[PDB]
Design a protein around this nucleic acid. Structure first.
Lengths: 188, 482, 473, 189
DNA sequence: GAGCGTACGGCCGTACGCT
DNA sequence: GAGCGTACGGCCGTACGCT
């Protein structure tokens, strides 16, 4: 499913994780195929803070990502083997896009933490005037979201390890009450 | 640019969670509807798919909603519309379907291009007075349409048809109830704001499932009505019959709510196969349209059918729990509500709907009376009116001259310029006076309602009593004591 | 009751076959549309989704078309609309899409709730004069709506955008053509009904693919235009060898994978590596690194033979004529189209004349009413009912039932000074308009010239350059 | 997928072959479950006049029918083993319904010919006022299509074996031209 | 022979909360 | 604990003609 870039120099290579073949086709058309790779994902991935390892390792989307990044998993992980120095989480500015963002960040936090620590994980969404990536023409997708000349990527930073561990357990973990209380306390 | 992983996680999880809560999974306390259901019913209203007109294909309604209100998969709309038409799912069905709308054995509805739908007579009551400024309209997803934020809901639908929804941080599970009991409860509450749950339970005995069956005791019911949470035990209606030759058989005629009959029978079959239950020789589904639900369990000679039946209640979905968790949107926020809170919010909603309808009708009537006053002046001095218009070069001059000469308003003068020559006839002249006099009396009647809060409150009671007498039916679920 | 297996088989197979033929798989010769495509375009017209208004979501269009005209899967409607918006599929795109509408590598369009659409400027021409009694309207599937049987189609769409369809007992495969060449062909036919195919080919050189590329010779073209059937060889534009244009309906990704397959299995040789250097900026670019001292001319000729780098277009010109499938040659296609245009213009003129004559009659009565308004008012005021008022107005002023009705329906605002002058000015202008319309209907040559003039305007406005090179040999 | 009847006496037993789970559910609800069985089929089946035996035998919908009828196929066919004496082809009065009717009759003619010869194969469609079986409520489906007391079934009869062999080869065979000529010749009707 | 495009059938998977 | 119902992702099969 991965539409790889021609370059094999990871420092200059970037991968855009897009939600569906609905954003896959347009980004594959709009990209600079020299240094930009596209990994279209089949909707919501497994919540790795709830799921057990055997279920996680047998998931074809989880497998696709591990294979594409070339770092490996925990015991065999290697940051020097990373095939891209930019892993861009591309989602829509909506309910489902927001959830996909949280599930993906959960996977990277629990299974590929040094990737965040190295500043390789980025976040991108449509610019104001659009709600979804599927609304955009490939040229606008390039000029506003993919063109390194003028784009809007947010680098994901790990500032406090204790606070992050607590946040991921509260929001994505098995205890509903902690999440319910967070919603109740921060509702606007 | 950079972003803290913690800040992003909290922000994105909150955006997702709130959206599922307020705009997807949970119903509003006032009308008992989730966004998708409200849209289907509004869609049916605007497309004039009323009970008195012919059925139209499901694809016309689905496509319209897809469409103008719900930019999600057409299957989500169709599936929700199908359930609303199922008499085993909805205590008071909201959709009048023609064709295959699915079965109790979990068989799906036919493709939307084959099935046909329209509103039920009771759905007219959900939408009644929607275009009389009773409820607040909001822009649709693209700003091209206007959609209701809530429906007038002239019957307490939340409790009547129940609800279930899995959200984020919470879930809802409201059982359906009997409409007669509910309206009686609202009427008792309308007379005494300080009414107790125990007093309300004299009207609202407990849940009332479309699938009938039994409820074991009032302890679970009471707990659920007092707190908003409680387990209610649902039992199938089963009798022990004689086969002949000293042999016995268990006959099941009613099963618990949301229980798949085919899957229940397959569970009984699995247990006899795995030898987990003994004394059963045969098991057959003798269900028909004419005879209703009939599941026959043949019992082995000399074996106690009472013991076998008690084991079936324990080991199979023949006895199922209804875990009550009454969560609904109150002032656009999720809230765990007890029986009294549910009825209070509903009654408050009804008072507002009728007050706003009366206020709208009064504005509408006062505006029309003002127009007729101008037309009456025009008809009394028509030779003068015509001269004024004929002498004028433009419509602006004609209007200014009519306002100045006959002390008319801009609105009155406009109505005279828009008056057809046909209206100068004898019958048309009398029609205007007759309309005016009738309107004067209507305005007085409306003003009487708005001057006294008790007269308005009684109008709510009278309108609810009419619904109760029209759509109120018999209790189906027996509450055994217990 | 009983039924013979033979009788049943023949009856059921015929019902199925004729329905796929007339109401699904094949296009009408006049507008070049299959039922689903006609419905999408009519739907866009009724929903006012014109080029001058803002985009609307595809779901809003699909849902309308599904419920009002096409009671089949919403994906069938969406898929057909997506293709209409693809500049690599349609020579003259009919849908103006915003968002992901698919790619040349067979990537699908985004969900219909994400994409937006509206009509293209050229689609206005397919629908032009539809509400001027130019075409016949028929009841929709449930009798609640009215839908066109054919569109006015003020440009020869069948040949312009081409067609393909698998039916029962037959199939169609018409390639797309250049609009300038086509209108020039129609104009040449309009001046000489006895024109030969060879003469027509002086205007219409051959097919013109949106994907450009080349055509090997005119033999295949000629055979297809003469008989309605013929193989046309499409060749990629290639000059290390660099491919800049690929044949029509060829998947670039699959073509590259086919070349990659040939190199791995040692089927072809003298090639180091192959890369898809296509970009939105550079356009189609497929580069193949040729091995040192190996003949690139020989390698390229083998690629044409062994891969879709050279693909055939099997022409099979089948279209619905008088609601029946027919194998048509180039002249027949243009004759049916020109005949359709003549009918559209004749019917528009006849409609405009009825409409004008009716209005002139109304203005005559209003002129009498305004000249004697004091008497008119007295007559109405004296009358108990509208029936009495009407009978009394017809009797005193010699007015018709229609004229008397228009006076009773007249608003008091129509009594102002400027409003009486407006009625006289409209009447005098209308008298001249009627004369102009009658001149068009009295002379078949004046009508035929009007068709020519209207077609020339389309040609000058939408006509573009040829993309496909027709290589000599 | 088959929803069998309680009775095991084939003489009184009937099977209704319905298009999709779209007609399956309503007929399963509307039937007399004592003597009426329902076999919901997943749309258009294989054209057995065009397809080869290996492809036919591996088809699940073909397999389900063979299993349900009991009989067996071709040389191993046994009319005495037939579980139902009425096999009703239930289709809609539309383009797709008509094709399903032709594909099913083709299967029955080439693989289960004595079943037609015994007068076991019947044809049913919605009554006038209805185009599709999915438009009908189970009670109407029963009262007009499934109730032996007042229904409209057409018994499929094999009159001329040579004419039928020719009809099935012309309409369902590999030679497009014979089919094209038949369409061209009979298009008026 | 395997795609094309109109039509129609099926089968899985993910989150979310509470049994 | 597979299922409930709102949301979203995927995959596969059938006919039909031509090449």
């Amino acid at each position: 499913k991965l539409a790889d870039c021609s370059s094999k120099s990871p420092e200059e290579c970037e991968i855009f994780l897009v939600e569906g073949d609905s954003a896959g086709g347009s980004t594959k058309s709009g990209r600079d195929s020299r240094t930009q790779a596209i990994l279209p994902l089949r909707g919501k991935i497994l919540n790795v803070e709830k799921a057990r390892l055997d279920r996680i390792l047998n998931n074809n989307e989880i497998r696709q990502m591990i294979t594409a990044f070339g770092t490996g998993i925990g015991g065999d992980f290697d940051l020097a083997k990373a095939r891209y120095h930019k892993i861009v989480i591309m989602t829509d500015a909506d309910v489902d896009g927001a959830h996909i963002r949280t599930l993906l960040l959960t996977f990277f936090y629990r299974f590929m933490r040094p990737l965040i620590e190295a500043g390789y994980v980025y976040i991108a969404q449509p610019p104001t005037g659009y709600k979804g990536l599927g609304e955009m023409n490939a040229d606008q997708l390039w000029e506003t979201t993919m063109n390194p000349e003028h784009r809007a990527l947010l680098q994901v930073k790990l500032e406090d390890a204790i606070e992050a561990d607590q946040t991921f357990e509260m929001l994505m973990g098995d205890v509903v009450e902690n999440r319910r209380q967070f919603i109740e306390d921060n509702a606007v | 640019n950079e972003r803290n992983i913690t800040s992003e996680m909290r922000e994105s999880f909150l955006d997702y969670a709130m959206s599922v809560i307020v705009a997807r999974a949970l119903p509003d306390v006032r009308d008992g509807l989730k966004p998708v259901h409200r849209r289907i019913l509004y869609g049916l209203n605007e497309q004039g798919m009323t009970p008195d007109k012919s059925y139209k294909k499901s694809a016309r309604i689905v496509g319209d909603v897809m469409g103008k209100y719900h930019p999600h998969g057409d299957s989500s709309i169709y599936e929700a519309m199908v359930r609303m038409a199922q008499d085993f799912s909805y205590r008071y069905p909201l959709v009048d379907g023609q064709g295959n709308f699915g079965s109790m054995d979990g068989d799906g509805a036919a493709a939307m291009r084959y099935t046909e739908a329209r509103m039920t007579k009771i759905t007219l009551e959900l939408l009644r007075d929607i275009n009389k400024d009773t409820i607040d309209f909001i822009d649709n997803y693209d700003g091209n349409e206007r959609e209701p934020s809530v429906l007038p809901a002239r019957f307490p639908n939340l409790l009547a048809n129940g609800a279930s929804g899995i959200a984020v941080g919470m879930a809802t599970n409201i059982p359906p109830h009997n409409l007669t009991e509910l309206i009686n409860g609202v009427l008792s509450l309308s007379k005494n704001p300080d009414i107790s749950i125990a007093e309300l339970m004299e009207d609202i005995e407990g849940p009332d499932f479309p699938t009938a069956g039994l409820i074991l005791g009032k302890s679970g019911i009471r707990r659920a009505y007092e707190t908003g949470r409680g387990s209610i035990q649902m039992r199938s209606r089963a009798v022990i019959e004689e086969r002949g030759g000293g042999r016995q058989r268990i006959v099941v005629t009613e099963i618990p709510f949301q229980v798949n009959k085919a899957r229940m029978i397959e569970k009984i079959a699995e247990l006899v196969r795995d030898k987990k239950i003994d004394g059963i020789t045969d098991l057959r589904d003798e269900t028909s349209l004419r005879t209703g639900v009939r599941v026959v369990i043949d019992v082995r000679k000399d074996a106690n059918a009472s013991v076998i039946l008690n084991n079936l209640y324990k080991q199979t979905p023949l006895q199922t729990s209804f875990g009550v968790n009454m969560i609904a949107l109150v002032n656009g926020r999720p809230k765990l509500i007890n029986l009294k809170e549910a009825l209070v919010h509903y009654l408050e909603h009804q008072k507002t709907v009728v007050r706003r309808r009366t206020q709208y009708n009064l504005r509408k009537a006062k505006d029309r009376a003002h127009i007729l006053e101008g037309l009456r002046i025009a008809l009394d001095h028509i030779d003068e009116i015509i001269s004024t218009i004929r002498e004028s070069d433009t419509d602006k001059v004609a209007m200014e001259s009519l306002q100045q000469r006959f002390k008319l308003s801009e609105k009155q003068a406009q109505a005279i310029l828009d008056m057809r020559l046909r209206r100068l006839t004898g019958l048309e002249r009398d029609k205007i006076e007759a309309e005016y006099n009738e309107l004067l009396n209507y305005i007085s009647e409306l003003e009487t309602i708005l001057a006294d809060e008790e007269v308005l409150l009684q109008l709510v009671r009278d309108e609810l009593t009419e619904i109760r007498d029209r759509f109120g039916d018999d209790r189906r679920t027996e509450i055994q004591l217990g």
